[PDB]
Symmetry: C3
Subunit: 144 residues, 3 copies
């Protein structure tokens, strides 16, 4: 019976810290997912490690709203973003990093194409996607 | 019995994140209320939306200590602050945004006056209040 | 039975806020300890008050890993760091601020020495320690 008062305070305090981080542009909240960036431009492998170290994962949009959030960060920092998906196994079918087949997509018209040996996916500042090599310097955006 | 250990860790972690935000000037804590700003100067309506989007509300002091906190942010950013109170209905009696009548006040001597058509309230950098129109650019301060 | 869903969401949200603060360099997490700095260089007494106001304490490393974390902040800001330990009572034996005798140490070779009247401890940017007077301007690093 004293849990409710205890749980309320906990939930309230969490709302406060999330409110502050949100108000100050430190992160974006979309449903249960929080997106954030450290502002750095590094390669795919480095991004993965940065996100993992923080306890999260390299961002990947699974809905238009999530896609738009990531896109907004992309245009805010004026940089393309590496997404949490690859097709290193067989070309054409992309997978999330857990192995599951990609469902929601937002390819720029004609994409994926050009290759060949393009295993990664980048997001343009308008939110559309392009398959690309994994060694370029791109904005690190993480999901928690 | 494993809740206590679980609740302790949760409370501890919350204290940590609040500690960090507090240490770095990201927010101010006064009792159960957290104040924060994104540093922007915008009109009354815009401030309201900014705070609401972050899950909070435009700040309003109900005690001298809360008033002093907001005042400190005001002088830190060298800007006046719109407060969460209006008197758009009948002139003279101000109300919080939920409708309740304003209790604690800190009017600069002679205020409210001048109008007429001044429905909003701004805080000077010394913490005293002035009634003012709602279209000026003022520091956005939110409470959570 | 609805606590699990409630506790999960709480734990998840906490992970999110800690993830964001961590990703952005706002703090360092080592075991159960969080380290953070406001970037300011002030004396020992001022640091203590700054940390206490934020709900934490002036940092003190009790393991090599904690020592390395603090050291990284030290070299990041290119400043030496006052640690949460003193020997104001009798010279030679240092104590944590709760009174307990210091266990883990990492003195630079030859230290402590020179004095005499050196009651505080500073960390060099390589992580080694030096006993020093308590009135110098040093990076404020707090633990939560
Ligand atoms: O499909 C695109 C396109 O061909 C680009 O112009 C090229 O720079 C990239 O290699 C590729 O990802
Ligand atoms: O009462 C004040 C005062 O008259 C000010 O000098 C004026 O600039 C504002 O209109 C008003 O809020
Ligand atoms: O032991 C050291 C050493 O002697 C330094 O060169 C001196 O600047 C300090 O007084 C002391 O902490
Ligand atoms: Ca390909
Ligand atoms: Ca392509
Ligand atoms: Ca009026
Ligand atoms: Ca007036
Ligand atoms: Ca000494
Ligand atoms: Ca010495």
């Amino acid at each position: 019976e004293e849990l409710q008062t205890e749980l309320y305070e906990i939930k309230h305090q969490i709302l406060q810290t999330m409110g502050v981080l949100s108000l100050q542009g430190s992160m974006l909240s979309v449903g249960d997912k929080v997106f954030s960036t450290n502002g750095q431009s590094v390669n795919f492998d480095t991004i993965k490690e940065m996100c993992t170290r923080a306890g999260g994962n390299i961002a990947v949009p699974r809905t238009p709203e999530e896609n738009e959030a990531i896109a907004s960060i992309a245009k805010k920092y004026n940089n393309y973003v590496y997404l949490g998906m690859i097709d290193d196994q067989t070309e054409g079918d992309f997978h999330y990093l857990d192995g599951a087949s990609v469902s929601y997509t937002n390819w720029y018209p004609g994409e994926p194409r050009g290759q060949g040996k393009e295993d990664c996916v980048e997001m343009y500042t308008d939110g559309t996607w392009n398959d690309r090599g994994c060694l370029q310097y791109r904005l690190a955006v993480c999901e928690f």
